[PDB]
Nucleic acid binder design. Structure first.
Lengths: 109, 124, 128, 51, 62, 216, 225
RNA sequence: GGGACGCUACGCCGCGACGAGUAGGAGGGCCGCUGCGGUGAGCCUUGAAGCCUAGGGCGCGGGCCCGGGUGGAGCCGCCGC
RNA sequence: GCCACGCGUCCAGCGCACGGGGUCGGCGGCGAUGUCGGCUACCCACCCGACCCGUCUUGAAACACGGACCAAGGAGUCUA
């Protein structure tokens, strides 16, 4: 009846100062601000939900306008609770600063 | 001889064609249709050849004799087999293995005959 | 319901975008075909960052999957009916393609001979 | 041949050194025996403190 | 980075004779089998000299 | 001919025996045990008799055929794999379904099946969840346990019983087994106060709630 | 026929079947003796110092005979005299490693390349992860992984080095055939140090990495390997 | 004393190491144009060359083959020159 | 705990597998007039990078010279 995923913000790609590597995304999950609290979210599946113009099919439902890019949480980034994620296709830069979902069903508990 | 004439026919021959990074030969006795020393039907003294029948039903097996090597009208004798699929493959296997007639191409004739019989099979 | 190949390997390509000529967008007299720059001050020639990539030997495709169609076959140009019987021992690996200048009545000679030999045709119903 | 790590792959180490089996046959019985004596010292410690 | 010189990493020698005649090539084909299947160095000197140029294999007077 | 005994040396570390081979030699008592040293079938025909050959030669040969692959050793079929289970997942604990159409439902774990899936079943009166399989990875394992040590699970229901056959209508065998198991569980969850309301509720994340911060 | 020839085929493979099993017993006993040698060598160094302190004097340990030399700097810009020594130690890439025995000649070659290398005396352990994990043999001028004892024994069998333990004993304990054993090993292709580096351009004495880090090279070995 | 593939040997297969580049040098081009000797019982008014193309593709690349439109009369593949 | 198995004389088959580079003898869905897939090539949006080519020069993006655009032609050939 409610939310089943943690709120995360696609801050940007894994990058240098003058070189970016847009095959690896950096995630800022809400509520985590330290390296030692990122262990729970390691291995969790992340998805970027967005809607488009043309109608596409939906598993177990009538075909809708929403689309996703599936991915997984790879390893922690930085020190202040940041984390890296890798998707099947590289995330578009329109999603910079937008909300993406990280789920719990890849659970280790 | 076989090795002497191969070095001439390997590049400047009318039966050879080359396109699309491939090489083929259209010799009458070149089963597998590839330009190679083993499969060249004209080079060797002893040659096995598999062709479709004249009436479209059956296979003709080309047999090259060793007597008239410079007598091409007599050097080739042709036998027609119009039996069932299992018996046709048994006969071509017997003519090559049990006669010791150029035995490295026994299965290659079996592969060619198995497709020619399939080609003349009624199409779905 | 098509003609399957013997095996279906995973086709991998290191690069699929075409190698465009330097400053080909800026001029119409400059064509898309690649020419290696040889200038003293050419940025592309000395591999500057954010410039047009040059073709190298490292972009070569795998030898197992080289010249292979996405369907899994390799093409072969065929002009007449007689060229079809070549491929009947290469049935599961190589396919046949009819030439552009082949007439419509000779195209409708070819298609069924490859259908009897189960030879896949890239363009079976060309003119009709 | 794929060079499997002898340090992680136990059998590759045994293929290169057969004595490694008794290197690791010991330091298991010894460490369990030494851990048993540590526990029994603590078990006897509770009798010394309470008496 | 590897501090090796590619100046002379490619040895310059003949792998096959530059002649296009077919009788020498059949003799070369015969002696390639003899070099790698027999243990004699004679089939290694003959095969090496069969590749050689006309000025490298001077005529021998009687 | 004789009865076989089990492996005399217990396993100490995987791949390592507890007893050495010479100590195994004395334990085996091998010191006093020295040891020294189709297709053609004849058939009658109504002439004479015929000798038929079984497994006759094939009538078809493809144009080209694949080469055979090399031999591996460490690859086993899925039926022969080892099936792991979490230490938190024990018979009698309460699980939370995340991926299935029973999202957020608190469902009671029964037993570990053969293929590795979990047989998980909350009461149909409370959770509206039948005897349903569930993969162990997509499961939140809450540390709330009941004692199902004294229940009698039916042996006839297994992985093949829950296998999809081929519109789904509930068979009467499913309904009988539904109340056969719930009759043992439902009195036991009533012994714990406010447990049936806990199972009827749904799990969700609100504002300020973080799964990594909380324990369960 | 084929009567005696088939049985001789059974007795042909049986010849190397018993010989391989006999060789396995020799390799087992060589490593058991080598395990005994490290009880004798490791304990007597403590034993010598313990009785010297009891007598009031000091026990000077033997000056170490072997050190592990790792190149830590790049290749863009190097003096030709310094470059000549670096290729004479088989250190051509960065983070390459080799075993070098100690004498007057080796010390002065290591002194002339001090900023470009970091070296020190490895432990008995540090040999094992180098030979087992990064041990590559140079057979017919080719870099071949030491995945079998017969690979060492094919080239080093004349020096009674016929297994992995014989090579380790020949390296760690500097024997009379150390030169042939060390030159058989390919230079060790080590990875970048996990955890970072203190300072590349200065000596280990002044808070850097270059120079002689006597027994601290074992800490650096674990991060390179 | 009754049996998979192979081998255009100018072919196929296995090991290791390496891959910067101006002037400059060398090698390979089943890269491209034109004409000649051979060769494909080659293509062609049921449509050649040329040109256009938001299509399918191939080759790292020089470039090439099909799909569609226009066009009306020649053109191309391989071996050498 | 043991890489130790016999006698006298003289001084071998069955299965298991940290074992010469991955398999499943494992599964779930949707697919006929609105759905699936289509690297490239058509257009558009965003992030990062990114100064216009040729040439002379130690040094070019240069406030160093040629250069509006397009089609055709256009420069190491031949003899000794």
């Amino acid at each position: 009846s409610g939310r089943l995923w943690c709120k995360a913000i696609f801050a940007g790609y894994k990058r240098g100062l003058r070189n970016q590597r847009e095959h690896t995304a950096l995630l800022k999950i809400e509520g985590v601000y330290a390296r030692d609290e990122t262990e729970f979210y390691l291995g969790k599946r992340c998805a970027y939900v967005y809607k488009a113009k043309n109608n596409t099919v939906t598993p177990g439902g009538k075909p809708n306008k929403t689309r996703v890019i599936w991915g997984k949480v790879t390893r922690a980034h930085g020190n202040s609770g940041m984390v890296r994620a890798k998707f099947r296709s590289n995330l578009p830069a329109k999603a910079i600063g937008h909300r993406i979902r990280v789920m719990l069903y890849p659970s280790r508990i | 001889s076989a090795h002497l004439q191969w070095m001439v026919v390997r590049n400047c021959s009318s039966f050879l064609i080359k396109r699309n990074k491939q090489t083929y030969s259209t010799e009458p006795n070149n089963l597998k249709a590839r330009n190679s020393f083993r499969y060249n039907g004209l080079i060797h003294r002893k040659t096995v050849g598999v062709e479709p029948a004249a009436d479209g039903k059956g296979v003709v097996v080309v047999m090259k004799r060793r007597s008239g090597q410079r007598k091409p009208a007599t050097s080739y004798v042709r036998t027609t087999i119009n039996k069932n699929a299992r018996a046709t493959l048994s006969s071509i296997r017997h003519m090559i293995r049990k006669n010791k007639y150029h035995p490295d191409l026994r299965m290659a004739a079996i592969r060619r005959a198995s497709a020619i019989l399939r080609s003349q099979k009624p199409v779905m | 319901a098509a003609l399957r190949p013997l095996v279906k390997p995973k086709i991998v390509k290191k690069r699929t975008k075409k190698f465009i000529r330097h400053q080909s967008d800026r001029y119409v007299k400059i064509k898309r075909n690649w020419r290696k720059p040889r200038g003293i001050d050419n940025r592309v020639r000395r591999r500057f960052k954010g410039q047009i990539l040059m073709p190298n030997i490292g972009y070569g495709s795998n030898k197992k999957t080289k010249h292979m169609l996405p369907s899994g076959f390799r093409k072969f140009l065929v002009h007449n009916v007689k060229e079809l019987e070549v491929l009947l021992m290469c049935n599961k690996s190589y396919c046949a393609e009819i030439a552009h200048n082949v007439s419509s009545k000779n195209r409708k000679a070819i298609v069924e001979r490859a259908a009897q030999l189960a030879i896949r045709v890239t363009n079976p119903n060309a003119r009709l | 041949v794929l060079k499997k790590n002898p340090l992680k792959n136990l059998r590759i180490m045994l293929k290169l050194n057969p004595y490694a089996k008794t290197m690791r046959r010991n330091t298991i019985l010894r460490q369990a025996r030494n851990h048993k004596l540590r526990v029994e010292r603590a078990a006897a410690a509770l009798a010394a403190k309470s008496d | 980075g590897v501090d090796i010189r590619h100046n002379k990493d490619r040895k310059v020698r003949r792998k096959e004779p530059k002649s296009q005649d077919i009788y020498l090539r059949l003799l070369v084909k015969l002696y390639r089998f003899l070099a790698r299947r027999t243990n004699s160095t004679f089939n290694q000197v003959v095969l090496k000299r069969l590749f050689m140029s006309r000025t490298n294999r001077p005529p021998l007077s009687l | 001919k004789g009865k076989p005994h089990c492996s005399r040396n217990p396993v100490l570390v995987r791949g390592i025996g507890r007893y050495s081979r010479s100590a195994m030699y004395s334990r085996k008592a091998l010191y006093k045990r020295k040891y020294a040293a189709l297709a053609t079938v004849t058939k009658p025909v109504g002439g004479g008799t015929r000798v038929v050959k079984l497994r006759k030669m094939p009538r078809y040969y493809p144009t080209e055929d694949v080469p055979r692959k090399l031999l591996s050793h460490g690859k086993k079929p899925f039926s022969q794999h080892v099936r792991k289970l979490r230490a938190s997942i024990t018979p009698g604990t309460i699980l939370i379904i995340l991926t299935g159409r029973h999202r957020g439902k608190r469902v009671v774990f029964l037993k570990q099946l053969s293929s590795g899936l979990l047989l998980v079943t909350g009461p149909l009166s409370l959770n509206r969840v039948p005897l349903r399989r569930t993969h162990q990875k997509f499961v939140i394992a809450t540390s709330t346990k009941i004692d199902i040590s004294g229940v009698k699970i039916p042996k006839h229901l297994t992985d093949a019983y829950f296998k999809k056959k081929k519109k789904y209508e509930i068979t009467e065998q499913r309904k009988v087994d539904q109340k056969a198991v719930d009759s043992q569980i439902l009195p036991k969850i009533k012994a714990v106060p406010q447990l049936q309301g806990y199972l009827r509720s749904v799990f969700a994340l609100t504002n300020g709630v973080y799964p990594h911060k909380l324990v369960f | 026929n084929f009567a005696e020839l088939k049985i001789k085929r059974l007795r042909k493979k049986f010849a190397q079947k018993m010989l391989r099993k006999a060789r396995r017993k020799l390799i087992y006993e060589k490593a058991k003796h080598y395990h005994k040698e490290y009880r004798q060598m490791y304990r007597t160094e403590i034993r010598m110092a313990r009785m010297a302190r009891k007598a009031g004097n000091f026990y000077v340990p033997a000056e170490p005979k072997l050190a592990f030399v790792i190149r830590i700097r790049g290749i863009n810009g190097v003096s030709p005299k310094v470059r000549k020594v670096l290729q004479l130690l088989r250190l051509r890439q960065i983070f390459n490693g080799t075993f070098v025995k100690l004498n007057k000649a080796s010390i002065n070659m290591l002194r002339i390349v001090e900023p470009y290398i970091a070296w020190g005396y490895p432990n008995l352990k540090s040999v094992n992860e180098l030979i087992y994990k990064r041990g590559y043999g140079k057979i017919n001028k080719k870099r071949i992984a030491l995945t079998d004892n017969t690979l060492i024994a094919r080239s080093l069998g004349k020096y009674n080095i016929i297994c992995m333990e014989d090579l380790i004993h020949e390296i760690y304990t500097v024997g009379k055939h150390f030169k042939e054993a060390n030159n058989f090993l390919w230079p060790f292709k080590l990875s970048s140090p996990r955890g970072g580096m203190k300072k590349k351009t200065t000596h280990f004495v002044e808070g850097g990495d270059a120079g002689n880090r006597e027994d601290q090279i074992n800490r650096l070995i674990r991060r390179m390997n």
